[PDB]
Amino acid sequence: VKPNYALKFTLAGHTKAVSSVKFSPNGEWLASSSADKLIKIWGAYDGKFEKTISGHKLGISDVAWSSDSNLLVSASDDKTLKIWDVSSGKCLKTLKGHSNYVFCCNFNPQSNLIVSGSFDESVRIWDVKTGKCLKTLPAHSDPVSAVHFNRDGSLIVSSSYDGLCRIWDTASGQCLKTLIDDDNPPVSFVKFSPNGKYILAATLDNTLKLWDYSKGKCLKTYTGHKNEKYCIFANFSVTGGKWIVSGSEDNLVYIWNLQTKEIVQKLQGHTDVVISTACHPTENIIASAALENDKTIKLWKSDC
């Protein structure tokens, strides 16, 4: 009925606002990125700092894991992405081609492609093996806030400040669907649901919306949190109860019942905007991260 997430750890070390946290697919690690130009790796279960990965020339807005938990990709204001070997900490490839800040990134499930979005208003698809850009998509008319592959990597969803969410065919780079809203608020985040049938989109009017993109039908809206300014991550929690999880500009983590849309828990502890949250792949664990008055990551655990 309701989860009971409780604070287990506070992870300090970043020296500027944290931007993104992601659990490894194997559940062992959390990676974080920051405006401080660093990636840090932490133990998912004991919160123990593992290592710092450095090399970007400017701040990092996003980080993502490969399926074998062996590679990370990061998206930086330095206009590049970097692919890293997590075990050695070494930069394997630098992905060059965007003409402005790279804001978001993700591997496909196969882990042979990376998708990125940029302030340059494009979405790029990259070959992991060669580090070469395969496709540049003239995707949006304003900064691209999020990019995400579906369950089998055949589709990409992108969101933008231009007010659109778009679905793309990975192989051809073609736009298959545009989702619109008459009042046209900036879209600050999007991702596919775990089954790939829906997308969850955040807009800067304090609203999260679950869409059946095929039908162009909005099925659920989640409200009551604060999101008017930042590109805050949201998540489907599937390990126990079925929840939607998001950060908020009132310094809380919000958790909603997926079906009823009721807020079922608010997690208190951060002292600045909660810009990023992540849900552990097998356990009822949430990671949350906050902006520069706080600069910490918190790990929370629930029984359901």
């Binding site: 500027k16 606002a17 944290v18 931007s19 993104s20 920051s34 405006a35 701040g59 807005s61 996003d62 204001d77 800040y101 804001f103 302030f119 900064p143 400040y161 900036p186 600050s188 800067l204 300014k229 930042y230 590109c231 810009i275 902006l291 520069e292």
Partner: peptide, 8 residues
Amino acid sequence: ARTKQTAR
């Protein structure tokens, strides 16, 4: 970029 306000 993400940690700063950049949207309309």
